[PDB]
Design a binder for this molecule. Structure first.
Ligand SMILES: C[As](C)(=O)[O-]
Ligand SMILES: C[As](C)(=O)[O-]
Ligand SMILES: [Cl-]
Ligand SMILES: [Cl-]
Lengths: 142, 132
């Protein structure tokens, strides 16, 4: 099964409202990869600010949802406070909108027990099509 | 020139809780912009990041620098890409985040560099923000 619900995600991650952006893990293979989703609703606090005349999920929150999914995989592969240390090669392909399901996959590149550093790639999809690519997210365990 | 929040809001469409530039200190069109974001415990995202340790999310530091870059673009006349982001040290309640963005290219695509400081010391670097 490998899927994880929100209550169990909360036991893994320190993040809470209004900055928890993984609704469900649908698949995970420890030390390899993880797939989850974020459901995108008009009823989310950020939408009033981004933007009044046109609701578009901020691209940086799409990085954040990929980062959080990625951090689930790291914690379940091996301090639950991981900070963003670097990110490279983010390309946003298409706007994410209220009504969408943001499906996300993060793949582990490296994880150093010793140093508390992890690197992963990430891709986000809507309706089977890429809306975001991230070449490399780096996390340090503060 | 310098720009206060009401004038910032006349340039940017961003509103609460996603307007992350509190002041523009200096702006030279087609060149550079310096501004700041004040970091308070009384911001909505801190309850979530994290309950037991309040740390300004790195991704919101990208966004603040991207919004600052957006102003310089609009006044030299979405977020398509970002690359070479490095966070050096956590930004905490009670800090002032001072930011500078430099225009690298305007070709229909604009590319800018970004730097964030807390007390003179770099807290974030962005080699490239890409807009169109
Ligand atoms: C997903 As994070 C680097 O804001 O804990
Ligand atoms: C970086 As933006 C498109 O939220 O101004
Ligand atoms: Cl955006
Ligand atoms: Cl962070």
């Amino acid at each position: 099964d490998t899927s994880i619900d929100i209550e169990d995600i909360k036991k893994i991650l320190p993040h809470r409202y209004p900055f928890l952006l993984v609704d469900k893990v649908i698949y995970m293979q420890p030390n390899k990869t993880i797939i989850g989703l974020k459901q995108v609703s008009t009823n989310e606090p950020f939408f009033n600010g981004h933007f009044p005349q046109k609701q578009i999920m901020p691209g940086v929150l799409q990085i954040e949802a990929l980062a959080q999914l990625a951090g689930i995989l790291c914690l379940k592969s091996d301090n639950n406070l991981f900070l963003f240390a670097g990110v490279d090669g983010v390309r946003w392909k298409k706007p994410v909108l209220p009504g969408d399901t943001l499906t996300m996959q993060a793949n582990l590149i490296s994880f150093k027990s010793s140093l508390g550093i992890a690197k992963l790639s990430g891709v986000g999809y809507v309706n089977g099509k890429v809306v975001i690519n991230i070449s490399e997210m780096t996390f340090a365990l503060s």
